[PDB]
Amino acid sequence: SSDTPEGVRSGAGAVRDAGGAFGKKEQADEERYFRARAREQLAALKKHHENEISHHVKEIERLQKEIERHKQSIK
Amino acid sequence: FRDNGKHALIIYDDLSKQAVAYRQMSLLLRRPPGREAYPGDVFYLHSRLLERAAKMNDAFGGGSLTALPVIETQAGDVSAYIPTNVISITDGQIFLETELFYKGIRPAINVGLSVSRVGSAAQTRAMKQVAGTMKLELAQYREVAAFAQFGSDLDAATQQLLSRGVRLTELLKQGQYAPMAIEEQVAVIYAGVRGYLDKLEPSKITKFENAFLSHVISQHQALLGKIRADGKISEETDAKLKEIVTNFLAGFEA
Amino acid sequence: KQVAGTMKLELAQYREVAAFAQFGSDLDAATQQLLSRGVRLTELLKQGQYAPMAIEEQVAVIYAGVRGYLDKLEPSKITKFENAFLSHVISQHQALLGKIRADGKISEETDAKLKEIVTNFLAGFEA
Amino acid sequence: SVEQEILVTGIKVVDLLAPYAKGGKIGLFGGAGVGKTVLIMELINNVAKAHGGYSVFAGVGERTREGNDLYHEMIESGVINLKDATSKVALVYGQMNEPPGARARVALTGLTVAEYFRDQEGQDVLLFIDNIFRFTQAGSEVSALLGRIPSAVGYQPTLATDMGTMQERITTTKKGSITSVQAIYVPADDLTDPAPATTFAHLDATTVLSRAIAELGIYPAVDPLDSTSRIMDPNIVGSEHYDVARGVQKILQDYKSLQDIIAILGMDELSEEDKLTVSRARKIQRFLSQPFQVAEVFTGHLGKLVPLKETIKGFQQILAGEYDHLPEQAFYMVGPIEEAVAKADKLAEEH
Amino acid sequence: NIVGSEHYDVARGVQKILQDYKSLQDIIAILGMDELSEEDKLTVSRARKIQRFLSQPFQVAEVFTGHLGKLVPLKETIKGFQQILAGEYDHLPEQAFYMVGPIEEAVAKADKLA
Amino acid sequence: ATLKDITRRLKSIKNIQKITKSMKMVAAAKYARAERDLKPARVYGIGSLALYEKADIKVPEDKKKHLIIGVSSDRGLCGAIHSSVAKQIKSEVANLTAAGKEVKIVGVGDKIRGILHRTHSDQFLVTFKEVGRKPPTFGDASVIALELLNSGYEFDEGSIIFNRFRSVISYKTEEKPIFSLDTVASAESMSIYDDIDADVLRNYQEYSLANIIYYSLKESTTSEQSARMTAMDNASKNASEMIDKLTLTFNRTRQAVITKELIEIISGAAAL
Ligand SMILES: Nc1ncnc2c1ncn2[C@@H]1O[C@H](COP(=O)(O)OP(=O)(O)O)[C@@H](O)[C@H]1O
Numbered sequence A: 001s002s003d004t005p006e007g008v009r010s011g012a013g014a015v016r017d018a019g020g021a022f023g024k025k026e027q028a029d030e031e032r033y034f035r036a037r038a039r040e041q042l043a044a045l046k047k048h049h050e051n052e053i054s055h056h057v058k059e060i061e062r063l064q065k066e067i068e069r070h071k072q073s074i075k
Numbered sequence B: 001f002r003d004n005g006k007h008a009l010i011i012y013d014d015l016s017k018q019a020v021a022y023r024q025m026s027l028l029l030r031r032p033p034g035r036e037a038y039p040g041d042v043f044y045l046h047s048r049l050l051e052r053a054a055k056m057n058d059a060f061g062g063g064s065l066t067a068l069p070v071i072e073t074q075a076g077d078v079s080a081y082i083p084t085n086v087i088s089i090t091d092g093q094i095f096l097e098t099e100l101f102y103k104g105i106r107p108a109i110n111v112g113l114s115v116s117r118v119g120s121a122a123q124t125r126a127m128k129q130v131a132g133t134m135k136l137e138l139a140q141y142r143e144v145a146a147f148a149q150f151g152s153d154l155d156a157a158t159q160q161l162l163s164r165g166v167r168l169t170e171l172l173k174q175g176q177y178a179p180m181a182i183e184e185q186v187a188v189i190y191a192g193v194r195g196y197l198d199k200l201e202p203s204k205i206t207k208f209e210n211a212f213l214s215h216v217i218s219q220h221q222a223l224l225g226k227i228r229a230d231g232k233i234s235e236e237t238d239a240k241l242k243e244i245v246t247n248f249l250a251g252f253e254a
Numbered sequence C: 001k002q003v004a005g006t007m008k009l010e011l012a013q014y015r016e017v018a019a020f021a022q023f024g025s026d027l028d029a030a031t032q033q034l035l036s037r038g039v040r041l042t043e044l045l046k047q048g049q050y051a052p053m054a055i056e057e058q059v060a061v062i063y064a065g066v067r068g069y070l071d072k073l074e075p076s077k078i079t080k081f082e083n084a085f086l087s088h089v090i091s092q093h094q095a096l097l098g099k100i101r102a103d104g105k106i107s108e109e110t111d112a113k114l115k116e117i118v119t120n121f122l123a124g125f126e127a
Numbered sequence D: 001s002v003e004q005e006i007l008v009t010g011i012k013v014v015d016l017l018a019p020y021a022k023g024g025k026i027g028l029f030g031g032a033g034v035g036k037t038v039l040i041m042e043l044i045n046n047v048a049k050a051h052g053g054y055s056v057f058a059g060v061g062e063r064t065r066e067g068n069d070l071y072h073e074m075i076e077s078g079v080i081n082l083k084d085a086t087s088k089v090a091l092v093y094g095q096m097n098e099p100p101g102a103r104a105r106v107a108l109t110g111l112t113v114a115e116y117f118r119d120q121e122g123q124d125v126l127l128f129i130d131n132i133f134r135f136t137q138a139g140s141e142v143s144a145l146l147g148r149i150p151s152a153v154g155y156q157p158t159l160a161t162d163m164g165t166m167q168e169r170i171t172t173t174k175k176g177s178i179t180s181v182q183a184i185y186v187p188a189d190d191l192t193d194p195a196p197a198t199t200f201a202h203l204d205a206t207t208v209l210s211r212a213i214a215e216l217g218i219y220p221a222v223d224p225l226d227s228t229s230r231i232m233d234p235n236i237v238g239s240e241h242y243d244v245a246r247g248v249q250k251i252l253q254d255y256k257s258l259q260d261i262i263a264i265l266g267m268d269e270l271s272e273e274d275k276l277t278v279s280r281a282r283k284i285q286r287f288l289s290q291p292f293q294v295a296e297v298f299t300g301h302l303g304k305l306v307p308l309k310e311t312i313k314g315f316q317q318i319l320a321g322e323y324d325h326l327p328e329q330a331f332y333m334v335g336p337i338e339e340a341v342a343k344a345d346k347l348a349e350e351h
Numbered sequence E: 001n002i003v004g005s006e007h008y009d010v011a012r013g014v015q016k017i018l019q020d021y022k023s024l025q026d027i028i029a030i031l032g033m034d035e036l037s038e039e040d041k042l043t044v045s046r047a048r049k050i051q052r053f054l055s056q057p058f059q060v061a062e063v064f065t066g067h068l069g070k071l072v073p074l075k076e077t078i079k080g081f082q083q084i085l086a087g088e089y090d091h092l093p094e095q096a097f098y099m100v101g102p103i104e105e106a107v108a109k110a111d112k113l114a
Numbered sequence F: 001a002t003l004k005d006i007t008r009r010l011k012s013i014k015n016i017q018k019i020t021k022s023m024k025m026v027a028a029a030k031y032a033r034a035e036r037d038l039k040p041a042r043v044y045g046i047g048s049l050a051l052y053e054k055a056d057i058k059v060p061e062d063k064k065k066h067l068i069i070g071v072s073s074d075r076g077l078c079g080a081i082h083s084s085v086a087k088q089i090k091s092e093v094a095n096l097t098a099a100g101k102e103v104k105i106v107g108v109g110d111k112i113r114g115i116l117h118r119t120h121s122d123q124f125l126v127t128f129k130e131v132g133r134k135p136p137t138f139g140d141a142s143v144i145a146l147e148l149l150n151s152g153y154e155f156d157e158g159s160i161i162f163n164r165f166r167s168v169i170s171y172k173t174e175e176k177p178i179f180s181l182d183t184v185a186s187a188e189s190m191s192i193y194d195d196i197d198a199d200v201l202r203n204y205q206e207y208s209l210a211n212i213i214y215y216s217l218k219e220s221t222t223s224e225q226s227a228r229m230t231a232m233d234n235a236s237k238n239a240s241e242m243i244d245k246l247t248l249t250f251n252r253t254r255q256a257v258i259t260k261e262l263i264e265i266i267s268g269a270a271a272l
């Protein structure tokens, strides 16, 4: 009874709207993934938080070389 | 009591039978029916009752009057006419279910849905320490512990947390007509959240509890009297309990 | 009537294969076509509030999508291309948006002239 | 008066997705226990202290307990002064221990004090009413005793007439203005009930609180795909505010089509583009939550008040990809986006 | 304290295994039996031996089906369910626990089919 | 029970009916390619079997060490593919470890290691991952056979267990033996066999290890796809029978609330 506007139809994202045993098979499945990516990315925050100083560091060295050029021009 | 100083408590068992005595009594007086032949003012029937449950100020006497209305519902449906009219008069609820009762959680309280406007959070000072962390460790459990079909293995990642729940779920079960005290509650809850039970088996924690509880009332009576008197679990009181659970765990099963 | 008889049919074939689009790359090249053409025609029909259009201008825009002059583009570049195709044809081709508003029917002498507008605009657009 | 404005309250769901208006009409929907006495007592803190004009709170049939907090929550906060004449609020209280003929006329004692401040004095007023469903519902308690045949589901046959007699006196004329905030109880979470569904036309702005969201800990509970304002318009709020809030709502409706796939295929079957959607959408969903100042007795956190220029900038970057390298627990219950990287460093130090 | 603490634990322990068969009927009907774990293919096969071991032939129903009405005593049901909960009969099929009296007829009906 | 609860449950299974009927059309194409690729590699495993017909070699009496290899995918929802291999594996290590030989298993793919990590958690040399998401190849069999040598474990007898694809409905789990020490590989049938040395038989048997894993990467991938088609048809037939029984309950429950609210009005007028 779906090929008619009078016959009722369903929405998008209604499986988790019921609250059955597929809505809790999916609410828990998402926590068993996005809890273990939360410590792949909590461990690599030691490195890249030092790398953003290393990039800044890189820039600093570059700018000091330019200064050096100007200082030699003056000389 | 309440208008003279003291503190009262009142249970209505139940309030779905004070409504069908109003539907019948006021149909034979020729009053026109509303929904489900209930009268117009069934909301006014329950509301003028449940607002006397006050808490007076201290320049009147300071007395209180709690109320615990019971409501029976049909087929566990909470969206009926007389349920929803009395959900929205009370500060908080305790949702008792059937699949909790039969799986084994007895008292069958849905601790997920049993919301409560906490009442200015007058839990008590020591229970705030151990059940503050318990509330979050159980909430962490319920998001992640509903598969019943496993394919992958993450014992360092997930299986440590869900082992803290079943030790705290099977701790929460109780008997009947034997209610505990609050410092006998702080002791048994201390041993669950502080990791001192993850080397048991969950089919032995209900056996672990009564052997623990009989040991502390008998041999450690001056310990529990410093939790009830001082209110809090102090840092030196944290020290003394650290041995007692481990001394008993050294010789529990032998 | 001339352009919507090819359009109402082809936006109806997209509705039957509209479930496959979520997780699909291992399908047939015909089914991967209906997911392509049907999502360009959906992007044409978007329209901002309080902007009614003249009739023969809509026969310009819909002639671009249903004939094949939008398949080689990106779907967030469809709702930009339509606005740039209209402002070029209002100003520099106003004499041909009154030859449909008078005659009514697209003759072949106009069906061969809009082929030399859309393809000679689809070159100098992507910049 | 025909003019529209904007109004900034400080909340990242109100100010981003359903913005208010100076003089508009604002209704707070949602069931029982979802957060309507908190969201209406937080806006009393935010707006009704930094305001030059006056305010009126009319209590139409609610708990007499909750009518003792707001009398004492605003004596210590300076809005009521019990010795001098510099108070800035007026209270009208007829509660749910009252016969149902007197719970139909405190809705009208409210907007008679809140009209002398608009018409007679040329001032600006704010109108706070909680709860306005008890005006309708206390008219169904004396319908058949008056002598009428009852209509559909049990309401009186004069529903949309006694309501619209009242909800047209709350307007902004050319002598003053009124900014009205009304809490609207939805009975049994049923929005298609005739008492709420005839109130969706007397209002400029709707903030609909759901319950399936506040069960996930997200607070304020406000539904992103069901709130709506009139001034969400690329000619009043600007064409940068508009492009953001029509991409937050577009990525949250993209989430629900994936949640039906996850329930069968599982999370580690999806492609690498659709995994990027769920991670940002869960980052956006957690970032819409914000610790209010009145949750300093419930949660123990500290309160935020985010300006509008930071709200647009923070959400613009999560959609771009400039925080794809963080855990989701940083974003839960922060203010600005610069506090959501000061948490991802403390989580990595205490690891 | 009334029905005896040994009986009370076979009572509440056989409702626990019966509820857990009901709480998976959404997934078994759609997906299949074959997408379950190994612990929850052992509250399914043990709670189908328990449902069948609650059907008894009555005395008044001999004239309908031609099967002898059986009366069991109390102490031979508690003893006969602890040997399905502990897991002693996990090799016998489920057609043997059906329409029998005391538990020794279940192993006898299992002895017949071979 | 009420009208809301019947609707939200019926709306859910109308979603699950679409998803599993699309998911059958996805896996009908994957099987249709994985039927094509297997018949080229059918003649590749013709050659290594033809070695053992003309020279009949067996495992003679006893070994000091052993291997067990079991292939699978990482993906679920295939019915009885993974438990038709793990339960075969536990049917042999019980049969072994009584003749005294030491056994150590390796499971390529995640789903074998998931089943056998609670009882057989100790006999694991290495584990693999990421099998069968992309189509399996021959360079994939040269990573299994190369890391199997960077292990130190001298192995003198082993076997591999895979599902031999029979038809669209039927698969058969079979076993095939592996002769890996040069002692058993140089026996009485190898007396006629010429110029290969002990150092050349070191070379030849090692290419057979990459070979015989490749023959079992082409069998267990077709059977894992064609049981992902048949078990999705039966989740789609079992959803059509659940909504047609829930439309009828919805229709009676719709009609019985029109009548219920109408008698509340008829009796509300006539009581005046
Ligand atoms: N910041 C918060 N956000 C969401 N809910 C909260 C917050 N702080 C407390 N709560 C809880 O949510 C409940 C909401 O109830 P309340 O808003 O007071 O009444 P109503 O039933 O009218 O919504 C309160 O009981 C409170 O315990």
Ligand SMILES: [Mg+2]
Pocket (backbone or CB within 6 Å): D036, D037
């Ligand atoms: Mg409230």
